[PDB]
Amino acid sequence: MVYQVKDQEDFTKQLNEAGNKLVVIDFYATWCGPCKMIAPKLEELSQSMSDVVFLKVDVDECEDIAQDNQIACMPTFLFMKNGQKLDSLSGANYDKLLELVEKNK
Amino acid sequence: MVYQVKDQEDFTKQLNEAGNKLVVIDFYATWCGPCKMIAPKLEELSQSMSDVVFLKVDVDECEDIAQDNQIACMPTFLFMKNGQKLDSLSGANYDKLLELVEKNK
Amino acid sequence: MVYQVKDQEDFTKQLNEAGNKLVVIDFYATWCGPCKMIAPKLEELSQSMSDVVFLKVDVDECEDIAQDNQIACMPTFLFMKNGQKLDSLSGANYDKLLELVEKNK
Amino acid sequence: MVYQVKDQEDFTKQLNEAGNKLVVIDFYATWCGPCKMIAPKLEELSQSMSDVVFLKVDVDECEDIAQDNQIACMPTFLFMKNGQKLDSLSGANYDKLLELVEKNK
C-alpha cells in the first residue's frame, strides 16, 4: 500500500519509520493523468517489495513539501535512504523507476 | 498585463474576448520555482504585445482546468486561437516561448 | 472609438470580444441627416466609456444585418449584452441614449 | 402598378408625366419589413385609383434622392402635386396614407 504523507512532521515520521529501507516518494496531483496511470503500478510494487517503502505526497495538499523539494513535473519520484536524497525521477517512466529502485534498495 | 483566470467560465470568457488574437496561457503553481523564475518575463512580454492575450492559471486554485488540459510539467504554456489549441510548451524556456509566440501570433 | 462592422461575421466577432460589456450599435446611413447629427456625440461618448462597446452598421453596406434587426427609422440604437438584445431606441435622442446606456451598462 | 424611380432625372420625368395628378412616392428599402408588408397594398391602390400616380424609390439605389428628401424612416411617403410638396408621412400607416391621398387628390 502507498501511504499518503499528511504534512512535514508526518514526512519525518515516515522517513524514521522506514528504518534502513529505500523510500520512494511519489509527488503527484489528482488532476494529473500520468500520475493516475502509474499509481496502480506503484501500489503493486508496494504490495510486493518488502525491502522498499513507498509514500505519496499530494502537491495541492502539501504545497510546502512540494516547494521544499523543488517539484516541477508530475509525477516526480524522490528516492531517499536513511534520510539522504539519492536520486530523483521526473515523469511516469516505470522502467527507469524500477532501475532506480533496484540500484538503491 | 497577465490576467489570472478565476475558474472554467472565466477561462471561456477570456478566450472569447481575445477575438482573433493568439492567447498564451501559463499553467503554474506558487510552489514551483521555474514558474516564479519566468513569471516576470511573461509579464514584460504582455505589456509590449497588445496583439496577444496573456493569461495564467494557478493549478491549485483551478484543478479542474488543469485536468482539462492534462498539465504535467510546470510551467506549461498553452497557445490558443479562436478557442482552439495551436501548440504547447513544457518548462521555462524563454527563447522557445518567443519562437512559439512568433510562429502563432 | 466607434468601430464600423464590416459584415455579419465581423458583427459576431465584435459581440464576442465585448465580453460582458454593454454593446451599443448605431444603425445608420450616409444619406441620413439625424444620423450625421448624432454621430459625433456617440464618438465622444465612446472615448469616455471604456466599459461599453460602441459599434456602427452602415445599412447600405450591410443590408443583411439591417434586415436581421428589422431597422425602420434611423438612426436606430440597439443595446446588447452577451449576444442578447436588451433595448432599442429609434431616432437621435441623446438624452434617451444616455438613459438607456445608464440603465444597461 | 408602382413605378421604380431610377435616378434624379427619372424622378423629374415621372413628376412631369403625372400631369396634374397627385403623386405618392414610397421611399423604401429591401431590408425593411414594414415596407414589404405595405407594398402589395400600394400596388392595389395603384391598380385602382386612376387619378393618383404611385412611385417608389429604393433608398440604397438612390441615396442622393433619399438625402435630398431628408428621409429618415422607412417607409416614408412623399405627396406631391404639380411639382409641389404637399405632405409627408413616416411609417407604414395605411389609414393615414389613405387620408392624405383623399385629402390631396
Side-chain angles (χ1 to χ4, degrees), chain A residues 15 20-25 52 69 77-89 99-105:
Chain A
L15 294 175
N20 294 322
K21 285 181 189 175
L22 177 69
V23 181
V24 172
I25 306 97
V52 182
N69 286 280
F77 299 99
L78 212 200
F79 299 79
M80 298 181 69
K81 206 176 184 289
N82 295 106
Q84 312 308 305
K85 171 191 187 303
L86 301 177
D87 271 312
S88 181
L89 172 59
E99 292 176 19
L100 293 173
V101 168
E102 310 289 356
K103 159 187 159 183
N104 291 297
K105 80 183 187 63

Coordinates of all heavy atoms in Angstrom, one line a residue, chain A residues 15 20-25 52 69 77-89 99-105:
Chain A
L15 N 9.8 8.8 7.3 CA 11.2 8.5 7.0 C 11.9 7.8 8.2 O 12.7 6.9 7.9 CB 12.0 9.8 6.7 CG 11.6 10.6 5.4 CD1 12.3 11.9 5.3 CD2 11.9 9.7 4.2
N20 N 16.2 1.5 7.6 CA 17.3 1.5 6.6 C 16.8 1.3 5.2 O 17.6 1.2 4.3 CB 18.3 0.4 7.0 CG 19.0 0.6 8.3 OD1 19.4 1.7 8.6 ND2 19.3 -0.5 9.0
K21 N 15.5 1.1 5.1 CA 14.8 0.8 3.8 C 14.9 2.0 2.8 O 14.7 3.1 3.2 CB 13.4 0.4 4.0 CG 13.2 -1.0 4.5 CD 11.7 -1.4 4.7 CE 11.6 -2.7 5.4 NZ 10.2 -3.1 5.7
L22 N 15.1 1.7 1.5 CA 14.9 2.7 0.5 C 13.5 3.2 0.6 O 12.5 2.4 0.8 CB 15.2 2.1 -0.9 CG 15.0 3.0 -2.1 CD1 16.0 4.1 -2.1 CD2 15.1 2.1 -3.4
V23 N 13.3 4.5 0.4 CA 12.0 5.1 0.4 C 11.8 5.8 -0.9 O 12.7 6.4 -1.4 CB 11.9 6.2 1.5 CG1 10.5 6.8 1.5 CG2 12.2 5.6 2.9
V24 N 10.7 5.5 -1.6 CA 10.3 6.1 -2.8 C 9.1 6.9 -2.6 O 8.1 6.4 -2.1 CB 9.9 5.0 -3.9 CG1 9.4 5.6 -5.2 CG2 11.1 4.1 -4.1
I25 N 9.2 8.2 -2.8 CA 8.1 9.1 -2.6 C 7.6 9.7 -3.9 O 8.4 10.3 -4.7 CB 8.5 10.3 -1.7 CG1 9.1 9.8 -0.4 CG2 7.3 11.2 -1.5 CD1 10.6 9.8 -0.4
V52 N 11.4 -2.1 0.4 CA 11.2 -0.7 -0.1 C 9.9 -0.2 0.5 O 8.9 -0.9 0.6 CB 11.2 -0.6 -1.6 CG1 11.1 0.9 -2.0 CG2 12.5 -1.2 -2.2
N69 N 10.9 20.6 -1.9 CA 11.5 19.6 -2.8 C 11.7 20.0 -4.2 O 12.0 19.1 -5.1 CB 10.8 18.3 -2.6 CG 11.1 17.6 -1.2 OD1 12.1 17.0 -1.1 ND2 10.2 17.8 -0.3
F77 N 9.4 11.4 -8.6 CA 9.8 10.3 -7.6 C 11.1 10.7 -6.9 O 12.1 10.9 -7.6 CB 9.9 9.0 -8.3 CG 8.6 8.5 -8.9 CD1 8.4 8.6 -10.2 CD2 7.6 8.0 -8.1 CE1 7.2 8.2 -10.8 CE2 6.4 7.6 -8.7 CZ 6.2 7.7 -10.0
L78 N 11.0 10.8 -5.6 CA 12.2 11.1 -4.8 C 12.7 9.8 -4.2 O 11.9 9.1 -3.6 CB 11.9 12.1 -3.8 CG 12.9 13.2 -3.3 CD1 12.4 13.7 -1.9 CD2 14.3 12.7 -3.2
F79 N 14.0 9.5 -4.3 CA 14.5 8.3 -3.7 C 15.4 8.6 -2.5 O 16.4 9.3 -2.6 CB 15.3 7.5 -4.7 CG 14.5 7.1 -5.9 CD1 14.2 8.0 -6.9 CD2 14.0 5.8 -6.0 CE1 13.5 7.6 -8.1 CE2 13.3 5.4 -7.2 CZ 13.0 6.3 -8.2
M80 N 14.9 8.2 -1.3 CA 15.7 8.5 -0.1 C 16.1 7.3 0.6 O 15.4 6.2 0.5 CB 14.9 9.4 0.8 CG 14.5 10.8 0.1 SD 13.6 11.8 1.3 CE 14.9 12.2 2.5
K81 N 17.1 7.3 1.4 CA 17.5 6.2 2.3 C 18.3 6.8 3.5 O 19.2 7.6 3.3 CB 18.4 5.2 1.5 CG 18.3 3.8 2.0 CD 19.1 2.9 1.1 CE 19.1 1.4 1.4 NZ 19.8 1.0 2.7
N82 N 18.0 6.3 4.7 CA 18.5 6.9 5.9 C 18.5 8.4 5.9 O 19.5 9.0 6.3 CB 19.9 6.3 6.2 CG 19.8 4.8 6.5 OD1 20.3 4.0 5.6 ND2 19.3 4.4 7.6
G83 N 17.4 9.0 5.5 CA 17.3 10.5 5.4 C 18.0 11.2 4.3 O 17.9 12.4 4.2
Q84 N 18.7 10.4 3.5 CA 19.5 11.1 2.4 C 18.9 11.0 1.1 O 18.3 9.9 0.7 CB 20.9 10.4 2.3 CG 21.6 10.2 3.7 CD 21.7 11.5 4.5 OE1 22.2 12.5 4.0 NE2 21.1 11.5 5.7
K85 N 18.9 12.1 0.3 CA 18.4 12.0 -1.1 C 19.5 11.3 -2.0 O 20.6 11.7 -2.0 CB 18.2 13.4 -1.6 CG 17.9 13.5 -3.1 CD 18.0 14.9 -3.7 CE 17.5 15.0 -5.1 NZ 18.3 14.2 -6.0
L86 N 19.0 10.3 -2.7 CA 19.9 9.5 -3.5 C 19.6 9.8 -5.0 O 20.6 9.8 -5.8 CB 19.7 8.0 -3.3 CG 19.9 7.5 -1.9 CD1 19.6 6.0 -1.8 CD2 21.4 7.8 -1.4
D87 N 18.4 10.1 -5.4 CA 18.1 10.2 -6.8 C 16.7 10.9 -6.9 O 15.9 10.9 -6.0 CB 18.0 8.8 -7.5 CG 19.3 8.4 -8.1 OD1 20.0 9.2 -8.8 OD2 19.7 7.2 -7.9
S88 N 16.5 11.4 -8.1 CA 15.1 12.0 -8.4 C 14.8 11.5 -9.8 O 15.6 11.2 -10.7 CB 15.2 13.5 -8.4 OG 13.9 14.1 -8.7
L89 N 13.5 11.4 -10.1 CA 13.0 10.9 -11.4 C 11.7 11.8 -11.7 O 10.7 11.8 -11.0 CB 12.6 9.5 -11.4 CG 11.9 8.9 -12.7 CD1 12.8 9.2 -13.9 CD2 11.6 7.5 -12.6
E99 N 14.6 0.7 -12.3 CA 16.0 0.7 -12.3 C 16.6 1.4 -11.1 O 17.5 0.9 -10.4 CB 16.6 1.4 -13.6 CG 16.4 0.7 -14.9 CD 16.8 1.5 -16.1 OE1 17.7 2.4 -15.9 OE2 16.4 1.2 -17.2
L100 N 16.0 2.6 -10.8 CA 16.5 3.3 -9.6 C 16.2 2.6 -8.3 O 16.9 2.6 -7.4 CB 15.8 4.7 -9.6 CG 16.3 5.6 -10.7 CD1 15.6 6.9 -10.8 CD2 17.8 5.9 -10.5
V101 N 15.0 1.9 -8.3 CA 14.7 1.1 -7.1 C 15.7 -0.1 -6.9 O 16.3 -0.2 -5.8 CB 13.3 0.5 -7.1 CG1 13.1 -0.5 -6.1 CG2 12.3 1.6 -7.0
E102 N 16.0 -0.8 -8.0 CA 16.9 -1.9 -7.9 C 18.3 -1.4 -7.5 O 19.0 -2.1 -6.8 CB 17.0 -2.7 -9.2 CG 15.6 -3.1 -9.8 CD 14.9 -4.2 -9.0 OE1 15.5 -4.8 -8.0 OE2 13.7 -4.6 -9.4
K103 N 18.7 -0.3 -8.1 CA 20.0 0.3 -7.9 C 20.2 0.7 -6.4 O 21.3 0.6 -5.8 CB 20.3 1.4 -8.8 CG 21.4 2.4 -8.4 CD 21.5 3.6 -9.3 CE 22.1 4.8 -8.6 NZ 22.2 6.0 -9.4
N104 N 19.2 1.3 -5.8 CA 19.3 1.9 -4.5 C 18.8 1.2 -3.3 O 19.1 1.5 -2.1 CB 18.7 3.3 -4.5 CG 19.4 4.3 -5.4 OD1 20.6 4.7 -5.1 ND2 18.7 4.8 -6.4
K105 N 18.1 0.1 -3.5 CA 17.5 -0.7 -2.5 C 18.5 -1.6 -1.8 O 18.3 -1.9 -0.6 CB 16.3 -1.5 -2.9 CG 16.7 -2.8 -3.6 CD 15.5 -3.6 -4.1 CE 15.9 -5.0 -4.7 NZ 16.5 -5.8 -3.6

